[model samples]
Target: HWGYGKHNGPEHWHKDFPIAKGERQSPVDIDTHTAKYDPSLKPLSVSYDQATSLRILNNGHAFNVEFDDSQDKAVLKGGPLDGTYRLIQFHFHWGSLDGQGSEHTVDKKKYAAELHLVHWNTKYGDFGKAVQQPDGLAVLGIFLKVGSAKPGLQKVVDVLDSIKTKGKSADFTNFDPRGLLPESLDYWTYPGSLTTPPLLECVTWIVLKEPISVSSEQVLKFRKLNFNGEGEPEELMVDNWRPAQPLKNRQIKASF
Candidate 1:
């Protein structure tokens, strides 16, 4: 029953999910000045097969594009990761205005949107089991700025109409998610938790330094979706981002 509304949103999540107040929570404001460059960190290896893309849906929080994880068809490896991690689903967070949408900020600066590529370590067998382990999950975070339109992202944006309300979904396939990535793979990494509640502290967050562009018109399309279901009072689904959490002295490393 958690949502982005004032009453049931991030501020109130800790009432039900106590870990919301726990250490290592996510979406921290990354102070680049303090992040240490780690030459030992390997270059991020991302291989997302086109056929692995399954469907796109409005999960009431944000629209998510799921990928088949039966095998390692789509995965994220290296770059502060210990092993291969399978891509489970990718979703986005945004603000009502272009000035503030991204979950994690850089030097206190927010972006128009943020893309999260959720992955789970194969060593833990499946997402269910992996999520409970300390080193189980890895999330690739990409920032979105308003500028030129991204044709690759347009594929998903074009289908938003079908899933305007909560819980609505459509069959989406043959899409390679890598198309949304920026040219640079440089990133800042840290030990963090899921930005959303349940908010388990199991993720190794890899936030990209460079951002891809999305036109303002394209971002407006995302605002058209509703947070409420088909019959509810019809609340616009914007400002779906959780505010940055406390770092609590966690070390953030940079892969330069």
Candidate 2:
């Protein structure tokens, strides 16, 4: 059955997987900023051909897209990042009982949802090995809010019908995530760790300040994703977001 209550919430995640408690958690408060802005830290131009394999997995909590390493030609513009990084996996975080769902907060404001596109350095053999390096990963955060319309998000919603059943997955063929990126690439970046298990401290986070909107029905559809697979009672998987954490002296910078 799909898990949806406090018993099945993030607080209990550690019970099922003890290691989660030690992970480098994200979705923290971005309360402070730095005056020094680095121009070299911008992202280099990316070609769609750089991503080789893309597979969507319904890992119980949410839909995660995993890509193959053969495609790794994207460029890194700035912020101490200067190498080829392969797109790995992308996942989403949402709220269960509340309206706000984003993992990262800006000026203490949380949005309706958050999407993370995870990438790892090519120097490391794979995501597993890359997570161990200090400069191994980069995660781009995109926020979602409930609104009138959003054309960029239509692709993801179009595929929801295929994976409507819990634990069900489809090829998601011919889908390019770049189309989902906001027109404004301006972002707030910082050095931080993963918000999930093993909490690797190697990730450089690029969080988009501007958010995209999805209809209320789309949000409801996302909330309706089953946590349980076929033959079991349906349980909602909505509200998988982690609460904001302490900043711990971390510095956040915005792309001007």
Candidate 3:
């Protein structure tokens, strides 16, 4: 199976999912100078209801807090998006150390971690179908820098012990994801793809400019999550991030 191991890492993903090297790939280094300021782009708006939150799961890749995406209760609109997109799930990627964890970089600078809130364009009907479209998926990329303790994030870390291994899950509800966002809504957007396997070229990437704070000790708790399941060889889940891909023919537009 695909993993972040030396034998089957991002470098080897093209063998199975050829789209790994496709045009408009994601997690590119965002050179601030090169990013064009587009006056036409509107301020990004997110309305996430706490009741819409469902459960949290360790899907062998990364831990994700899923939501009841059957309705448009939690939605993202405006900005570079042509239509509304429903919030499906949100996950994170981190490194073994605090110095390098974020997938997307700004001015080639790495953060301690990165948060990805995955959404599907409402026009696609479902996430499965949306993944196949050029503009089906819309992911919000938020960087997590190590500093002060984030109370909102602490609520998420408190439940990590219950799901230490792969394939484990627990009920997660009444969580308002808005508390986890930075103060500013300024963002850099471009056409991109999924960072992991089956790296489909369908995501419309909207990466935020400001980074949220995370405690140094909190990141250590995240490392406790095991990539292996129970009764399997112990393998800590760290460095679960894809390196920055080439910008290629893409132009990142900023909504500042």
Candidate 4:
């Protein structure tokens, strides 16, 4: 119901979407030193057929890479959860070259960008039903470092030209989402919410401590994309990120 602006940013979200102030909110400052070591945590189980990628879109918010969730073809398990969670779609959040962008930060340091691979529990039947429950959605947050151009990520940024405007979409295939992940599987786990509107408190966040690289050139391309629709006044699609929230009573668990 809101756009990322002075009047609609995270600071004013509770006005329209009261859930922004709800307990167990997301995008927190992760302090691994205080986090407990969870030896019981399982190594992540990730399986995805690249062909299952449905499409990519610039939906006036962020560029989304959607996956076909009709079957249990691409699913994530182990790590920090009890049941298998199927990957439905993925998206990114970023800011201008001058400042911080990522939603989740480590030791209070922010990255240039953050990528989210959203999944839902199969026990909840579908993503729609799962998103409303406490343990329903599981999102993998992979931090993006700005430096060398990532070959795996190049395949994705290459498509931005086609979907530069809002509400535009294109078919993207032969790309494995896993290729964009970090070399390390070790992560910090916690219960959080969606960083955007509705801010549903259903996400079980698995944030990778290690980050992947992206060139400075790619950052400009991302900024060039539109926040308004095709006919509206042009505005940069920068700073599409929510500030980190309070830790509350939650304890981040690390799988080391």
**Candidate 3 lDDT score at position 110:** 93
Pairs with steric clashes in candidate 4: none
Global lDDT of each candidate: 0.93, 0.70, 0.92, 0.88
Residue 222 accuracy (lDDT) in model 4:
85
lDDT of 4 at 118: 93
For residues 70-189, write the lDDT of model 1, one tens digit per residue: 997988898888889999999999999999999999999999999999999999999999989989999999999999999889999899999999999999988889789999999999
Please identify model 1 stretches exceeding 4 Å from their true place: none
Task: Give the root-mean-square deviation of each candidate in angstroms.
Answer: 0.9, 3.2, 0.9, 1.2
To one decimal, what is the Cα RMSD in angstroms of model 3 from the true structure? 0.9
Q: TM per model? A: 0.98, 0.84, 0.98, 0.97
Q: Report the lDDT of model 2 for residue 251.
A: 67
Candidate of highest lDDT: 1
lDDT of prediction 1? 0.93
Which of candidates 1 and 4 reaches a greater TM-score?
A: 1
Model 3, 1-256: lDDT tens per residue? Answer: 9999898899999999988888888789999999999999987888885337889999887999999999888888999988889999999999998889999999989999999999999998999999989989999999999999988888789999999999999999888898889999999999999999889999999999999998988898999999999889999999999999999989999997
Model 4 lDDT tens row, 92-190: 999986358899999899899999999999999998899889999999999988888877787788899898888999998656887788788889999
Could you tally the backbone clashes for each prediction? 0, 18, 0, 0
**In candidate 1, residue 77 scores what lDDT?**
95
lDDT per residue (tens digit) for residues 100-198 in model 2: 788888777888889888888888878788888878898888888888667756767767766756567777555677765777777778777777654
Displacement of residue 222 (Cα, Å) in model 2 is 1.1
- Runs in model 3 lying further than 4 Å from the true structure: none
Q: Judge candidate 2 against the unseen true structure and give its global Cα lDDT, from 0 to 1.
A: 0.70
